[PDB]
């Protein structure tokens, strides 16, 4: 089997992407944030504290003939940006782009933190990291991909995120029309539960390539590209007027600037992030100071190849017995 679903930016800055997901019988369609950096499928629901729901579409298990309470199971998650959610668990039928899993753990939120409430466009998350990170207790649950894997034509999913445009998540096949050239595959460590890999280096604009190992994660659920302070300093040094602002919380630059591209290495291959992908617009409405899309990972504890990087590529998440990651230009 295979699935194919379109993923759509939530706003004009590509702050995140939502993908429609059918849950239950009859189907309840919720727009979820597919997140290769976490492993819980959780939703706004009929159980969510009412004051914490503001425009989201909710899952109502009592209206699904296939929903079953997973007795005694609870979940609680905290993300790298400080947001969080928790609740209880149902199993139900979940379909993505034509691909159906029965008995999927659907984690129903009783509580969500303010940033979730304030984002009316995201109805929940669908985790696509390794199931070892799933927070359900006392019986850890599998991701949608893990549950689907055996039924897939090939044990893979791909992320093809658009720049200021829709893109695609495919399950079980590689669309050879969706990229140019060849796909370069690179080793993955699952030791931290992430799609963790090592980039072979970087270049800034038309500058020379610096060969250097950069360990990081391919994370569709993080907006920006977070890299070591040395790398980030080298990038922003090429933008006149750019500076790190502690009050804003990262590198800002004059909105009048033309940003250089940023290249990252995948083995001997190179993925080029156009300058425009690195512009996240005015820090506040009307400001001429703009927020940068490449930021330091210092104090995160991990480097993150988030959407800024991933949307420049066609990315294969290969869930074979020994997982790997593939990157192609497009």
CATH code (residue 321): 2.40.70.10
State the alpha helices, DSSP H only, in the chain: 114-117, 144-148, 229-236, 307-310
Residue at a domain's end among 141, 174, 207: 174
279 and 135 within one domain: no
Which residue precedes each gap in the chain (C to N above 2.5 Å)?
Answer: none
229 and 110 within one domain: no
- Measured between alpha carbons, how far is 295 from 293 in angstroms, rounded to an integer? 6
- Measured between alpha carbons, how far is 100 from 50 in angstroms, rounded to an integer? 30
Q: How many domains does the chain have?
A: 2
165 and 200 within one domain: no
Domain range for 312: 175-330
Residue at a domain's end among 150, 174, 198: 174
What are the structure tokens assigned to 282, written together?
Answer: 């005015």
- Measured between alpha carbons, how far is 220 from 15 in angstroms, rounded to an integer? 11
CA distances to 86, 87, 179 from 131, in Å: 17, 18, 29
Choosing from 38, 85, 199, 261, the catalytic residue is 199
- Measured between alpha carbons, how far is 246 from 171 in angstroms, rounded to an integer? 41
Choosing from 35, 92, 123, 160, the catalytic residue is 35
196 and 123 within one domain: no
Residue at a domain's end among 111, 144, 174: 174
234 and 155 within one domain: no
- What's the resolution in A? 1.5
243 and 156 within one domain: no
- Measured between alpha carbons, how far is 312 from 308 in angstroms, rounded to an integer? 7
186 and 140 within one domain: no
Distance of CA 311 to the CA centre of its chain: 10
- Please report how many Cα atoms fall inside a 13 Å half-sphere around the Cα of residue 309, on the Cβ side: 27
316 and 224 within one domain: yes
Q: Residue 278 in contact with residue 294, Cβ under 8 Å?
A: yes
273 and 160 within one domain: no
For residue 249, the SS3 value is coil
Is residue 35 annotated as part of the catalytic site, yes or no? yes
**Method used to solve the structure:** X-ray
What are the structure tokens assigned to 220, written together?
Answer: 């569709």
146 and 24 within one domain: yes
84 and 118 within one domain: yes
Handedness of CA 10, 12, 14, 19 (dihedral sign): positive
Is residue 39 annotated as part of the catalytic site, yes or no? no
What's the burial of 245, exposed, middle or buried (CB within 10 Å: 0-12/13-18/19+)? middle
Q: Residue 209 in contact with residue 266, Cβ under 8 Å?
A: no
Q: Residue 10 in contact with residue 167, Cβ under 8 Å?
A: no
Distance of CA 173 to the CA centre of its chain: 19
- Measured between alpha carbons, how far is 144 from 290 in angstroms, rounded to an integer? 37
**Closest Cα partner for 126 from 42, 29, 17?**
42
What are the structure tokens assigned to 53, written together?
Answer: 């729901």
Q: For residue 3, what are the contacts with CB-CB under 8 A and spacing of at least 6? A: 95, 96, 97, 98, 99, 148, 169, 170, 171, 172
282 and 262 within one domain: yes
What are the structure tokens assigned to 215, written together?
Answer: 């360990």
């Amino acid at each position: 089997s295979t699935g194919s679903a379109t993923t759509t930016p939530i706003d004009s800055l590509d702050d995140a992407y939502i993908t429609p997901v059918q849950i239950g019988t009859p189907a309840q369609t919720l727009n979820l944030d597919f997140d290769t950096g976490s492993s819980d499928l959780w939703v706004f629901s009929s159980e969510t504290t009412a004051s914490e729901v503001d425009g989201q579409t909710i899952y109502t298990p009592s209206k699904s003939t296939t929903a079953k309470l997973l007795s005694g199971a609870t979940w609680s998650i905290s993300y790298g940006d400080g947001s969080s959610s928790s609740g209880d668990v149902y199993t139900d039928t979940v379909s993505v782009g034509g691909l159906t899993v029965t008995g999927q753990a659907v984690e129903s939120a009783k509580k969500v933190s303010s940033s979730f409430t304030e984002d009316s466009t995201i109805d929940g998350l669908l985790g696509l990291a390794f199931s070892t990170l799933n927070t359900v207790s006392p019986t850890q649950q599998k991701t949608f991909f893990d549950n689907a894997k055996a039924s897939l034509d090939s044990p893979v999913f791909t992320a093809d995120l658009g720049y200021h445009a829709p893109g695609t998540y495919n399950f079980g096949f590689i669309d050879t029309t969706a990229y140019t050239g060849s796909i370069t595959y690179t080793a993955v460590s699952t030791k931290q539960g992430f799609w963790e890999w090592t980039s072979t280096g970087y270049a800034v604009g038309s500058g020379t390539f610096k060969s250097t190992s950069i360990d990081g994660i391919a994370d569709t659920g993080t907006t920006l590209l977070y890299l070591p302070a040395t790398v980030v300093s080298a990038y922003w040094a090429q933008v006149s007027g750019a500076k790190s602002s502690s009050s804003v919380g990262g590198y800002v630059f004059p909105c009048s600037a033309t940003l250089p591209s940023f290249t990252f290495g995948v083995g001997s291959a190179r993925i080029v992030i156009p300058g425009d992908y690195i512009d996240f617009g005015p820090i506040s409405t009307g400001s001429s100071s703009c927020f940068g899309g490449i930021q330091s990972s210092a104090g995160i504890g991990i480097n993150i190849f988030g959407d800024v990087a991933l949307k420049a590529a066609f990315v294969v998440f290969n869930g074979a017995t020994t997982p790997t990651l593939g990157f192609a230009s497009k």
